[PDB]
RNA sequence: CAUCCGGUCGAUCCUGCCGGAGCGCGACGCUCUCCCCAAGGACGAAGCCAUGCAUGCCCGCUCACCGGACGCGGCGGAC
RNA sequence: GUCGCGGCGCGCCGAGGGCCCGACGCCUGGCGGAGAAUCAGGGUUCGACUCCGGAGAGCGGGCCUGCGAGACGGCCCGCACAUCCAAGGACGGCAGCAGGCGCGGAACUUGCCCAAUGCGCGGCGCGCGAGGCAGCGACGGGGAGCGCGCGAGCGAGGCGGGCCCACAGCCCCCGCCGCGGAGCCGAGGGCAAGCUGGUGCCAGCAGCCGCGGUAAUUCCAGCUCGGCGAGCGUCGCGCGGCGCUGCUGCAGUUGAAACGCCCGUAGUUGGCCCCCCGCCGCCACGAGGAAACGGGAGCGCUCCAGGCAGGCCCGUUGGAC
């Protein structure tokens, strides 16, 4: 047929599935380690950073803001969930930043936004929006 | 209902002074339990001693 | 203009639901023993 | 190390794969009001139970009739079953075993057989009492509902002397 | 213990991927009536360390003090 | 020379050895196995950590003692750090138990004891941060509950007495009095669960499709309802989904994809035929070789997770395989 089938061609196959496995793209991210060093997170379920600057078919403007990460020094750009969340964070502030559903991929009609904002001076971000805490310290 | 345990005879007063566990003795009425000492002044004890040299008594 | 721009009725106060095995008991009968048409308006109506 | 390490553990029950299907949250609230279950992990427990019986049998009935290991494990399996009383007695060959229901599980339910009894009102009501151990196993008293008798047991299952 | 579902069109059949549905390992958030078992600074810092403890025992050798100190000697410290 | 064979080292001689059945070189967020996660079958990923084996004690070297060490809670040197100094000098190695700083998304008391298991030295014992007990502990696993019915009863909890304990707890038992407390997500579809008031492509929701520009079934609130439940939700990774890595089991006219054609080595595959001999593969059985984990026989820790037990007249009680 057109793959080799005889008793002894067991070399030829484990060679073909190993050259041609790597023709997967989720593969290829996976195992492959240029993601591993690009990803900012460095493989981390979240980070900790400091903010700098906040910022802003559907036409509408969503609040974000500018963070660098303490780990690794670089900038990237994290969102900030809930309605009128944004007066919580104050420019110069330490944030612990998250990311979205999707591993990498941008969610939703945000363009090129792929972190969450959760806990803004050591407060969880949604329970300061139902107020079972409070940012009096801050 | 029901509640079951272990014995022991012994043949006379002094093998059983002989073959006990202290602390056995001690919750018996049989002997005085002497005031404990915490092992650590012990071993600070110990080790003091071992810091001096020839006649180490006095400490 | 301010952000949250966008951002009250007394509570009903009423006896708690059971809880454990009973809150399970009442949905038994809720459904088969005592009369229902799940949510509509006619049915909330029927209870005022 | 610690000796506590070499402890072994396990899970007890299977969670379906689907979880919102109307026939079987239908099912599933009917058997809870029959048996009057407390929570939906004692169904989850019970179909474990059934699952390995069921595994147990089909192993061991892929094999000839005349085979030593067939004969040793289905003899060990339906001695289980005729005393933990899941089987009828009459019944002694091995397909019988793939027909089970965890109806007959739940039926074996200290509550279950103190209320054929006629010994309490309701299952609930059994339920109460058993949490105030009034009940009493032969000699012994049993404040666990799910307490699971066996058929030479049933006829020495009575009230607790010391209740009141 | 052999399961699929929504999205390209004015409608239809495919390829093809995106997303959902389950389990397990960790971290974060809210919350927590009673009992039993139970892991616990490993995660490109094998980075830096106040303070205390973690290895002793005794047959041989007593003109020490009132035979017990100490010391020499022996075994162990490579588990 | 070594305990000892050996290019292990030295002198002489000759030239060889390895490689597409993948040498050499480079990289690894590389300790290995017994095993763990997942689940028709076939498989994929991981394997710091309990048992075994290996390596190390800041980096690199050297050595004495001793049967046994290239030892580091043994010594010497260089390098990098660190401490006291009455300035001439002396001195250290927590990847041991607690504890502290730094780092990070992430991780406990500077507690008591040798009573049990063992080791060392020994006659009626000493020592052991091995180990055991307690404390913090929503990693996680297992069992009960916030009622039943027309009156009673029962817990949690409190106060005393036992039992246990090296001493204290805790469990369990006996008396008197007696707090019953549910949250987290969601209601357009996938996917089970619907009425009022605000706002007006703004604010916001939304993993995907999508909603919002005057009834908004989707935002913000109240009512009602649904799922799991002492737990629920969010983020990242692995398996499954996926017959989208296909040995079982994909596709190649037009969707992505048959080299422009021929010869040809390595490689892979090769018609039929002899009844009994030899060899290779193959099937079955067997010997030998750690347990733990997994499966599995038996046993009512009140059940269960578990563990190897218990009553009596016990297979020689058992711990089979
Ligand atoms: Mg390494
Ligand atoms: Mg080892
Ligand atoms: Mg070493
Ligand atoms: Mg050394
Ligand atoms: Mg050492
Ligand atoms: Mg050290
Ligand atoms: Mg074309
Ligand atoms: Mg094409």
């Known amino acids: 047929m057109s793959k080799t089938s005889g008793l002894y061609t067991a070399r030829k196959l484990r060679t073909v599935r190993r050259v041609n496995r790597w023709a997967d793209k989720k593969y290829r991210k996976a195992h492959l380690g240029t993601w591993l060093k690009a990803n900012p997170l460095e493989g981390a379920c979240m980070a900790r950073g400091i903010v700098t600057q906040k910022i802003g078919p559907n036409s509408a403007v969503r609040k974000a803001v500018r963070v660098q990460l303490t780990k690794n020094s670089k900038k990237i750009t994290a969102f900030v969930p809930r309605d009128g969340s944004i007066t919580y964070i104050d420019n110069n502030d330490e944030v612990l930043v998250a990311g979205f559903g999707r591993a990498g991929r941008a969610v939703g009609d945000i363009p090129g936004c792929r972190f969450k904002v959760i806990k803004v001076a050591g407060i969880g971000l949604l329970a300061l929006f139902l107020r079972k805490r409070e940012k009096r310290a801050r | 209902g029901h509640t079951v345990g272990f014995c022991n005879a012994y043949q006379n007063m002094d093998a059983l002074m002989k073959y006990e566990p202290g602390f056995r003795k001690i919750r018996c009425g049989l002997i005085e339990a002497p005031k404990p000492v915490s092992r650590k002044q012990l071993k600070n004890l110990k080790n003091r001693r071992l810091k001096k040299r020839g006649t180490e008594k006095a400490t | ?48 | 190390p610690r000796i506590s390490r070499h402890r072994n553990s396990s899970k007890t029950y299977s969670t379906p794969k689907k979880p919102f299907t109307k026939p079987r949250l239908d099912a599933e609230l009917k058997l809870c009001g029959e048996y009057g279950l407390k929570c939906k992990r004692e169904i989850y427990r019970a179909r474990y139970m059934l699952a390995k019986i069921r595994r147990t049998a089909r192993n061991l009935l892929t094999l000839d009739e005349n085979d030593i290991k067939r004969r040793f494990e289905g003899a060990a399996l339906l001695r289980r079953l005729h005393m933990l009383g899941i089987l009828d007695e009459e019944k002694d060959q091995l397909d019988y075993v793939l027909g089970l229901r965890i109806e007959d599980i739940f039926k074996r339910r200290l509550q279950s057989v103190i209320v054929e009894s006629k010994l309490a009102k309701s299952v609930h009501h059994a339920r109460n009492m058993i949490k105030a151990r009034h009940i009493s196993v032969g000699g012994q008293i049993v404040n666990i509902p799910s307490y699971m008798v066996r058929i030479s047991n049933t006829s020495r299952v009575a009230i607790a002397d010391t209740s009141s």
Request: net charge positive; hydrophobic share 25%.
């Open chain 3, 1 to 48: 203009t301010s952000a949250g721009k966008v951002r009250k009725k007394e509570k009903k106060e009423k006896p708690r639901p059971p809880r454990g095995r009973a809150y399970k008991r009442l949905l038994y009968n809720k459904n088969f023993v005592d009369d229902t048409r799940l949510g509509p308006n006619n049915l909330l109506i029927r209870q005022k």
